[PDB]
Amino acid sequence: HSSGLVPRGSMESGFTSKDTYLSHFNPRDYLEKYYKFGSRHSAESQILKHLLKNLFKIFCLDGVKGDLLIDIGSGPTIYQLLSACESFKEIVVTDYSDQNLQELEKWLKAAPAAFDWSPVVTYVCDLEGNRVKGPEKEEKLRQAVKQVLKCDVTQSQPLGAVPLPPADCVLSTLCLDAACPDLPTYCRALRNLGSLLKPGGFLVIMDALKSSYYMIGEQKFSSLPLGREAVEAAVKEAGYTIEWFEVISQSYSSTMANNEGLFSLVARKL
Numbered sequence: 071h072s073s074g075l076v077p078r079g080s081m082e083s084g085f086t087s088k089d090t091y092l093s094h095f096n097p098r099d100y101l102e103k104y105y106k107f108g109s110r111h112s113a114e115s116q117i118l119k120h121l122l123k124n125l126f127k128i129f130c131l132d133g134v135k136g137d138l139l140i141d142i143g144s145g146p147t148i149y150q151l152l153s154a155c156e157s158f159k160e161i162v163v164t165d166y167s168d169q170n171l172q173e174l175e176k177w178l179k180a181a182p183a184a185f186d187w188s189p190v191v192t193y194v195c196d197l198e199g200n201r202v203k204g205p206e207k208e209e210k211l212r213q214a215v216k217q218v219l220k221c222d223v224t225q226s227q228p229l230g231a232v233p234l235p236p237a238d239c240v241l242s243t244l245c246l247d248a249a250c251p252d253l254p255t256y257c258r259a260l261r262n263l264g265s266l267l268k269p270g271g272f273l274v275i276m277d278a279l280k281s282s283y284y285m286i287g288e289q290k291f292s293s294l295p296l297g298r299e300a301v302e303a304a305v306k307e308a309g310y311t312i313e314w315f316e317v318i319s320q321s322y323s324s325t326m327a328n329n330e331g332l333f334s335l336v337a338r339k340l
């Protein structure tokens with residue numbers, strides 16, 4: 071323990087170790103901190119609002135759609151799946167943190183103590199032209215998530231021995247910056263993720279730019295600080311062609327992250 075000097079579980083290697091996410095990452099503190107849609111004019115809400123807007127553009131407006139979408143790094147969050155749910159018959163959510171899976175499974179069964187995503191669901195519904203309502207939307211997403219699996223991006227087999235068909239798309243929101251301690255592992259993880267993709271399948275990555283850390287209240291966690299070029303290069307190296315690539319200037323509040331914006335991209339496997 072370093073008390074804010076360095077991120078938790080990082081004094082030895084410099085990067086927050088994987089095991090720190092099984093112990094100190096409290097998903098309910100994370101949800102309450104980063105995904106409260108109460109004040110819609112907060113720097114966090116603006117990030118989430120742009121994530122959804124981009125997810126809406128990829129999944130409802132563009133052509134990213136198919137049988138299987140593997141979500142890598144789901145965290146305790148389901149916002150990243152609201153738009154994809156309209157485009158994929160089956161979604162698979164994955165994450166390293168058991169507590170994250172724990173909170174995910176509470177929402178998948180609509181338990182009362184589960185985090186309330188209803189204000190977030192409504193905004194997406196608006197983006198989708200209000201063809202549905204809040205409750206109908208959640209049920210559709212809940213019906214499409216067929217598996218809740220362990221995940222490890224540092225393994226050649228990221229979803230373990232679990233046999234899945236090749237997915238049409240792979241989606242990772244705010245995962246690789248926290249998971250990959252360096253660029254070679256970042257590049258390698260992107261290569262392992264491709265082992266789950268149909269040839270010519272889509273890869274969708276939205277993460278922070280130039281972020282050495284991010285805050286969960288007083289708990290600091292390591293993030294890999296990446297420029298657009300470092301991202302673009304690691305992706306192309308992993309066996310991908312970048313179809314489009316966006317970079318935004320909006321950043322998290324000074325109390326929450328030192329990132330210099332966010333990036334979003336769609337890439338296909340060669």
Ligand SMILES: CC(=O)N(CC#Cc1cccc(C(N)=O)c1)C[C@H]1C[C@@H](n2ccc3c(Cl)ncnc32)[C@H](O)[C@@H]1O
Pocket residue numbers: 088091100104143144145146147165166167170221222223224243244245246247248249250277278281282283284293294322327329
């Ligand atoms: C998906 C999310 O919401 N996560 C919480 C945040 C955030 C956040 C928010 C704002 C800015 C930034 C930033 N500055 O970048 C990060 C991260 C994820 C990472 C994930 N993790 C950790 C190791 C690991 C392995 Cl080895 N393999 C697969 N997943 C793994 C672990 O489970 C957890 O859920």
